[PDB]
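Case study.
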Amino acid sequence: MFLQYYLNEQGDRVYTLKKFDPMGQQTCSAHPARFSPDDKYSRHRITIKKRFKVLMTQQPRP
Amino acid sequence: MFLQYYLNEQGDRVYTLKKFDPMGQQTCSAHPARFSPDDKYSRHRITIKKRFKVLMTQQPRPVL
Amino acid sequence: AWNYSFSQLPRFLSGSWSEFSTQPENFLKGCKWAPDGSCILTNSADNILRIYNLPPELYHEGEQVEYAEMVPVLRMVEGDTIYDYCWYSLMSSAQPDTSYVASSSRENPIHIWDAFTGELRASFRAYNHLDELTAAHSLCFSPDGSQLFCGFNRTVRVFSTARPGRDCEVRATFAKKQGQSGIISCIAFSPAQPLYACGSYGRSLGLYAWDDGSPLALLGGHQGGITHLCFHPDGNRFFSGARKDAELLCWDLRQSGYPLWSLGREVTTNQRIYFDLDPTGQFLVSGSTSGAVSVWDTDGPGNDGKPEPVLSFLPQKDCTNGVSLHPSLPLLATASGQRVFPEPTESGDEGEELGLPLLSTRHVHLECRLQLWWCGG
Amino acid sequence: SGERTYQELLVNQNPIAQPLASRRLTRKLYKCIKKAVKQKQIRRGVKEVQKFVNKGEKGIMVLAGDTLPIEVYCHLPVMCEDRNLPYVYIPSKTDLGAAAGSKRPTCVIMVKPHEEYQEAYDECLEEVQSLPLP
Amino acid sequence: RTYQELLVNQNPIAQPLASRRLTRKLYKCIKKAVKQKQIRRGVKEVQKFVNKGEKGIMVLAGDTLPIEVYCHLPVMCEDRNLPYVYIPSKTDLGAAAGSKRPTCVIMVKPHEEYQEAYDECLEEVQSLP
Amino acid sequence: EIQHAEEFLIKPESKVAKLDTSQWPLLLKNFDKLNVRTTHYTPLACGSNPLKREIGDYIRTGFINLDKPSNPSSHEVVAWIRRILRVEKTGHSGTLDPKVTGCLIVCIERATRLVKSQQSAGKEYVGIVRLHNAIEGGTQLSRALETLTGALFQRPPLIAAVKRQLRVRTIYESKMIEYDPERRLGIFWVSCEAGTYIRTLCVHLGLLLGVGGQMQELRRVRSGVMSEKDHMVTMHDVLDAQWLYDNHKDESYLRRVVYPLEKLLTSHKRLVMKDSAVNAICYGAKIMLPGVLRYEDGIEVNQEIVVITTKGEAICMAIALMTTAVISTCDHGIVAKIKRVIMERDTYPRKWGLGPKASQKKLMIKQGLLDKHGKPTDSTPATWKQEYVDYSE
Amino acid sequence: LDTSQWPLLLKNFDKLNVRTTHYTPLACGSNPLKREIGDYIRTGFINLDKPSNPSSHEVVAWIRRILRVEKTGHSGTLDPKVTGCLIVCIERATRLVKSQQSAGKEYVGIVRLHNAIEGGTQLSRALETLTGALFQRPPLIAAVKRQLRVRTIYESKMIEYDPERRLGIFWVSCEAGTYIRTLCVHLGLLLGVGGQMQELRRVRSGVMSEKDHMVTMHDVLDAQWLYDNHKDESYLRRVVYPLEKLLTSHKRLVMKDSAVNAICYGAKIMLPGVLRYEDGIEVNQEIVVITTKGEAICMAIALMTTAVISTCDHGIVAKIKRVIMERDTYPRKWGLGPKASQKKLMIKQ
Amino acid sequence: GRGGFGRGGGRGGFNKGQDQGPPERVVLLGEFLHPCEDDIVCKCTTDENKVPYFNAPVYLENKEQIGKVDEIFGQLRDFYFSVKLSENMKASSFKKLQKFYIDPYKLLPLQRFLPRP
Amino acid sequence: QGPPERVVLLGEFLHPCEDDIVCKCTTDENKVPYFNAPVYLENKEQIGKVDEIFGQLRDFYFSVKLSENMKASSFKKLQKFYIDPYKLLPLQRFLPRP
RNA sequence: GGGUUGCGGAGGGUGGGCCUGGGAUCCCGGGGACCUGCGGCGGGUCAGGCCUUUCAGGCCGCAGGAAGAGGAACGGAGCGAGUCCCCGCGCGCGGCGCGAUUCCCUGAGCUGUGGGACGUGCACCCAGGACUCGGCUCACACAUGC
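After joint prediction, the assembly is written out as follows.
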């Protein structure tokens, strides 16, 4: 996959083909990660997200 | 009881296990003294507190 | 064949002083031998169960014995303060299973460690009525080797050795009209008849039955509280030692309700002074608090009887807490220990004046070592 | 070392700790207490102190400077004032308890002269009767 | 300047980082060990072998999005009582691994006598705040 | 200044009363800008707001915006969501290819009523076009891209089933962002209606360029009214929500990912109605004048409207027939017709029998003057017969 | 003075949506702060610190004997050997104690272990594992009634841990009914070493905590002595606080003065009686109605929504649940309405 | 039911030669623009309403089958289509301004393609 | 007095705890054990009963009391523990009150 | 849901109304109710079997109704007894704390910011939810105006 994108100043998605931003940021992938149906690792994810305060629960609702 | 605490900067209670604060303060007990119903020594308490101005009335007013 | 007799002064052969120095203050107490006599248990102020090994008897056969430091083969850890400790009754090197030691901490339940491996094998817990754990003070094994006795506030509980759980037989002592005392100091067994004596801390002594569990006699105490109690193996005799008392008493089962004879000791502070008794009944070694280990003689001709002192010797200037002798081979181990109360003397004036006293309490030396004495023939 | 220790003790005090003593005053008081404890003439405990003040016993009261909360010893100074008795405050708890002859902190202590060791006790009384009161 | 740029392009959840020389020592150790016996580089195989149990050191990447890719590995190492590291580099780690596409997870297992430098990194990770 | 025990009393100022309805929830926003008709009705207790709704109805009723992985298909992720949420029905907004990512609207039980209209909605697509030969400059590619604008023909690829027939799809906007000559790739953004194919578009672009090509990948940016900028959630969060609900009993993480179905019908005109008519319309009826409470200014004839309740629940979607200037003057008649029901049949107290005219007509039937099936009976009052045959009979 | 610095039930009264402002101000009335001592003591709550020596059963008796009242009640039945906050009400304040008892309370206790632990990480994991809904049983032995209880726990984290003394303190935040002794027992069984609870200290009890006027019973005794020997009520007002402060997070509903007596005698809140309301009032919500001065009349259950009462003209909006005011408080004016009274007299004539 | 010009038979009308051989009628179809990967894409100049059929053989002025219409694209106004070349042919041979012809009855009116409600 | 019958898998050995066996519940997929319920082994032998129970809703552990003439060092491995099926209780009625 | 035909050589594609029945632009005769939600009606390989499934369009079978939509008091509050779920003395009450009057401890068993023992007494044992029945006071209630 060669689809990269970086967050805009306003907050929109700007798709690009390069891997480096002219401002000095490293672009990430635009496609989501592989999801497995037999994924029994949902408790560790929630714990490590609660330890660092990164869940969507603490995020407000626009 | 080995349950001490020290006042924090913001103004909350921070319970600790040691008897000495790392800043250089002496920690105190977290539990109050035992109360006695038949206590006739309440007249001198208000006198002591007025002599040193440590009454709830001599302190600022509650914000509510 | 080594004849056991007191003719000369005890001889120093080996010692151990490299340990018990890492802590600011440390005190040694206990130092009893094993029934077979191949291990030594030493308890310090810091809770560490040290099992010292026995020096080789072939090394003791000759007089060329050189000084050596006995390294502990086992070093166990304990959280809270220890109350009592004893070896198993039928302790032998032949049987590998009957080679465990018992210990009772302050808030932790009665723990049992193994001499061979060094790890906790079993543990007996005892709860009181609501939900909490009660502390045990007395610790001694039964001669048959199937039951375990422990002391408590006002009752005695009997534990087994095959079902390590909560099941235990309770035997209350205090009642509405009767009652012995408060906290029970220790419990010692007699090998002549099935009965044991219960020594408490409140000037009280009593003997109970083995299986029936019924009081027979009830006596008092010197002035304070009994600390240690043994039994004379030759017959119906047994001694008892209390704390903060300068007198000793020997109670006999052939007398009805009064002390037959009285002896003199030296106890200043509330320490746990031990006194060992020879299995042949010819010598009675006992340590004092003023730093003087005295020995007595027990005569049994038939008509005259009086404990007479043979000799006396001071190992160090400290307080000899534990004194015990080896069962077969001539040997005697002693340990010292004494607390130091904070004495905030005016050091500023001492450093300013430099005059009359020229003394400071900061340089006082206190070291608890473990010596081994030799007995000749 | 003495000045820094005194400052550290001043830091950890009680709100009601205005009547105090000097360095030599505290040393003399400690020496008097250490000379009087060996004669068994000292009382340690608010219970017996107030029990005998209700009846009446003349002496010198020695309270601690660092003891929380405040409601523990709050009626003792007024009782001593009504009974016309002076009281002493020192910014220490461990040293006051060690001077009694133990390894535990003690706050309340009453002294009673029985033997001829009062030649230094009267000086301490006259000195505590002259310290500036708040 | 370089380490600052690597810290700018970092993942949110990565506390246990390394210093400027500890990462060089770890890179040297990994480059020495990749030729001696073996190094495991794959999420599936790492988790499959951790399910049964294998002692080692987990080498995760500092720049790998999204976070849901590697999100249950460190908690699994904590449950199995195993330490892990974090490095703000993926290209250098991928080049040191097999001179190929940038890898994310790397496991090391000592077989030869090269553990004299491995226990030092182990105790350094155990001392990491 | 700490004022304690001060005389505080609300001063009775006889001023005009104003209300600010700009911060109220989704369907209650600007509820005071609707022209008032009648404020004499008896509100019923059976009802609530979509925002503060029970979790049982929050999971049952509502949509979700998912970011589909590129590994599985759309039906497979739909079935996975149905198995994770433990529901019976589940639907999607568009059948995406396995190797096509982007947003996807998914309803579950009661929001699947209007999926037929959601499927036929304009969607945006972003993919990479691969070439075979080389192009001279990017200006020629931009010209070829702007040439393929408007309505054009499209042939179904061999992949799905077979070439069936020729379709006519319309494209609104298409512009290229970048183009790399070294790798012979390039990203582009196309915004068209549903049914348009991107692989066929790439094939046509390659045929126009004279080098050929296909569609490498594809990414959806906007699908209808919801895009990647409006709380785009993934499947891992949906899977973690069920675990956090069955292990920690926390419904916040489930209400954050699931959104009420009333959000879709936001750009449509709302029509407030009485609580006595909601059940009659759910069973099925026509919208009358006495039931209408408020209407939106700027309503034309034959316009897609939505019927809402005073609390804010979407009853159903109707087709308005009268104008605001006509509904302000007219007294009786039909204004809307039932098109697609969204609520249940038994949700409000069932009452449509009693009334000012219905009871009178029923009593006249019971007497014997008028008949139930026969309209032209005696009918002594002519003004009654001339004011009852104006709706449908 | 601004509208955001006013007393307890008076902050931001302008933000309340206005519907009508034509009412007659009556003479009778008072503010909660400037209330008579007789009513200031009989109405209100007290957040005192319970000594660790007695139990709460004796503490409530001592406080009702000192305050010389007839009725009193506590917020939570605490053990004898535990310290923490405790809310005690009076005869005119124990009406809403049933809802105050069922509230989330935080706990802080120390756990004593038996064997040795390797590090703090494993015990931290064991503490994080016991989070959420679990099974618990009474520490003592009970009958078939108390066999299994199901409680939930929100947060649990440990501060420190001493390996030399084998202790460690922790903070747990859960709801009422959860036990701490069983929690430490389960923690010790999970660590494989066993253990129990050494002590316990409550930091939060419902809405009140140790940072909001932590008074002591000694202060209550000093106030009772000063109010009788010196006739000083300031030190008595500083310890006692009105009961209208507990219902601060609940929505407010301003009513007319003529409807106060109707609600007191027992009636239904109508549309003309409501003066203002609060945005965000859903169906079947625990609402409390107040007067124009700020005195809480009673607690009600609102039926209609803000979007419904903003349009409606007549109907029932709230239902009487529990009265808090007295009966004889406002004049008797029921049948004097503009149209309703006219219709009633018309049907009467 | 089905029927007409076949479906189980064969007939003929105005144009004949699609499957028989020599054609009779021919109509201009497209104009050569440029080759496309061994295929020829053309633009319809003047049929005035019509689009070609699937796999429709294309002829030149001399009525010689060069290939067949493979794909069709473009807008409604500007329409294009591709031609699949046959064997033993060269795409570089036809590189001039010439017209391409097709059979007249291989078209379809766009009036039916227009959406009618 | 009950003879041995069909037995169902109960738990998995985790670690001992003060002469008690602390086990982790296996896949019975909704079941919780009864108090003082006899636990059996693969050879249909009465090992002990079920002691106090703890744990969360999904993953919950349980401790087992030993019988007479039993040793805790015997099954110091990862083996399965079986329980009678008549000592079960549905939890579907615990969380929902209606 | 069923049926017919024409256009392009050959199992594949597209398209067709309110008009008909009889007599000489006209007349006569007829077509016997609607809304809503769900399920199916298509493709591929060799007279039949297998798999998946809805873009374009109506048909069939089932579940409810004859829908012009009323309400300015059906409707409340303070108490007493019984049982269940609830309360740490588990239905055995004295192993509970504070005080005048006595004693002991730096105990190494908690322990003087208290504990150990004897004698003399006062206080300590109370609350939530559901259901049946008995029983009093108030009122029967849309909330103006100056």
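Observations recorded in class. Chain C touches chain I through eight residues (CB under 8 Å). Residues 29 and 322 of chain C are 5 Å apart (CA to CA). We will return to this complex in the next lecture.
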